[PDB]
């Protein structure tokens, strides 16, 4: 089966994994150095062993492709993946006036009444970013995030570099280039950053008219993280191939610190008892070819018949 | 055996490898995405199936560790690995007055008389960089190279960042940091560069008091390149572990475009018929602990009993 590598990864972590502590107060079972690949011509690696919201994936990837760093776009598609980070900026602001939302997330798990308070404060925030253009510009903009790293890498002289843009051009004019890399990691920012890029770097490769892509991920959450991560990138491989008029090859996922939080042991175990099902299929608008102008209506996922979803507490 | 992974890599390329063209006018047999690891507590992965000059490795690594970008240091240790690049700058200069050294290297293979001329011009260059301080400062300095990337990453405001320096500090104060990355890849330079870093990025990891390191290499020459590359990094893992007072773990080598030039087929084949021998051992000066101040006399390689060397034409 196509998703077998993921399940393989999960079991391995359950065996060779060593308990290692981390910043998120929850014990983890980690592994350093792991590589798995997916032949994209066999199917789209969206997990069938647990329902994975392709919608959130599609819209978040498009957010990146546009070079957008503002949460507003995400919110208008019912994608709250990036809310937490923008909300922090808001609550730590002097312009903020409301209940002490300190250590929230951690504080939510341990305080049901506070949680409803917190969730209400958030509801306000999302609303204002969606309506108050100044507020959005002032608190909805993440600034340093994948879109600005991928497409607006600030040069040491005011300029901005569109990494992805040039790479895609290099792929057309020089398919056999061993230098087709896009990096999300910038040393100057890394220390002054809330969350340095989990998706550190990726490389495209062309051979026999098929386009492959490899991703180096310094840190990964086996349960909650990896399923979305495999999706975002197997899709990006398709997207770039679609533009460049190339066939799709393999998606190679290389890990640094692959880890399973101890509070997801039962869940990952249950998912493991499930038998995968045939992989879904991707369908990209044949007319439209410039991926930067794509929209939700352009990417179709046929035949995705997943198993039921699995609820697991996020670690924080 | 410890070097088995290398030989495994070689065979695989000879089988699953697909002919792919490249910039260096010689056909190659490539593979995209490959990972191999070496348990350093079993031995130092210096190839025993062919004599590999550990001297060149040791001195080049120290060059990096010092944050030195000038060829002069290398030349005073009989290390000419980096001559070619500095020589180019010289011959393309207006201050240069001598025979047209265009397309040399390629031109050398095809022109014996010219080769002796070229080799003589070089002899002059090396001599002057070693003696003429102004000339060294003007033509011996590579500028953008591993030492300046590792330790003098220029910030977008005049400053300079000592990546390695901080990481090593982070390893001591936060061993379990999943963010222990040093990147050699800078988007602003990459287009304006003679040779964008082959050794793109690396990550340290700490668990059970053992220090492991993973390297992402976008491009690799299986025959001539990989043996030195495994050495430089397995050593660096030792060096950083020595400083941080940690045990040594594994060295994980992840490849992007692993390739074997078609003119090394016979040689790699011959090397393959050889049986590996017990791995050598590293010995680092127990007193001296700050690796940045290390010198040749500090790193000892015990019991290295290699097979004879293998001559193979460099591809260019
Ligand atoms: O899609 C994603 C986003 C984040 N992470 C994870 C990795 C870690 O679980 C946590 C980051 O920890 P640090 O390495 O930055 O400390 O977020 C993923 O695996 N997948
Ligand atoms: O120690 C080294 C130095 C360089 N390279 C190689 C990789 C390619 O053979 C060539 C660079 O080709 P490009 O990818 O930059 O085009 O140099 C190595 O493998 N090992």
Task: Describe, in plain words, how this protein is organized in 3D.
The structure is a homodimer. The first copy, chain A, has helices at about 5-15, 55-65, 70-75, 85-90, 105-110, 110-130, 135-140, 145-150, 165-175, 225-245, 265-275, and strands spanning about 20, 30-40, 155, 160, 180-185, 200-205, 210-220, 245-260, 280-285, 300. The first copy, chain A, has about 325 residues and is an alpha+beta fold. A six-stranded mixed sheet of chain A has the order 1-2-8-7-6-5. The interface of A and B includes residues 161, 166, 176, 196 and 214 of A. Bound molecules: 2'-deoxyuridine 5'-monophosphate (UMP) (2 copies). It is classed as transferase (methyltransferase).
Give a brief rundown of this model:
Chains A, B: It catalyses: dUMP + (6R)-5,10-methylene-5,6,7,8-tetrahydrofolate = 7,8-dihydrofolate + dTMP. The structure is a homodimer of 316-residue chains. With 316 residues, chain A is α+β, with helices and mostly antiparallel strands.
């Amino acid at each position: 089966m196509l998703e077998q590598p993921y399940l393989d990864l999960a079991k391995k972590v359950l065996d060779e994994g060593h308990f290692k502590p981390d910043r998120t107060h929850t014990g983890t079972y980690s592994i350093f150095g792991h590589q798995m690949r997916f032949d994209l011509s066999k199917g789209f690696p969206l997990l069938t062993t647990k329902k994975v919201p392709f919608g959130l994936i599609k819209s978040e990837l498009l957010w990146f492709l546009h070079g957008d760093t503002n949460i507003r776009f995400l919110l208008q598609h019912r994608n709250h993946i990036w809310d937490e980070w923008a909300f922090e900026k808001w609550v730590k602001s002097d312009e903020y006036h409301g209940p002490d939302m300190t250590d929230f997330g951690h504080r939510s798990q341990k305080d049901p009444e506070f949680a409803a308070v917190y969730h209400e404060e958030m509801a306000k925030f999302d609303d204002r970013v969606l309506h108050d253009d100044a507020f959005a510009a002032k608190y909805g903009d993440l600034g340093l995030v994948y879109g600005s790293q991928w497409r607006a890498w600030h040069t040491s002289k005011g300029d901005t570099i569109d990494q992805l843009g040039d790479v895609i051009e290099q792929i057309k004019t020089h398919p056999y280039s061993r230098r087709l890399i896009v990096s999300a990691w910038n040393p100057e920012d890394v220390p002054t950053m809330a969350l340095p890029p989990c998706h550190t770097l990726y490389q495209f490769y062309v051979n026999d008219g098929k386009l492959s892509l490899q991703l180096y991920q310094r840190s990964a959450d086996i349960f909650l993280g990896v399923p979305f991560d495999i999706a975002s990138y197997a899709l990006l491989t398709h997207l770039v191939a679609h533009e460049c008029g190339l066939e799709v090859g393999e998606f190679i996922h290389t890990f640094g610190d692959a880890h399973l939080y101890v509070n997801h042991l039962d869940q990952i175990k249950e998912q493991l008892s499930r038998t995968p099902r045939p992989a879904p299929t991707l369908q990209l608008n044949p007319d439209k070819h410039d991926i930067f102008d794509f929209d939700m209506k352009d990417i179709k996922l046929l035949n995705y018949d997943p198993y039921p979803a699995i609820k697991a507490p996020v670690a924080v």
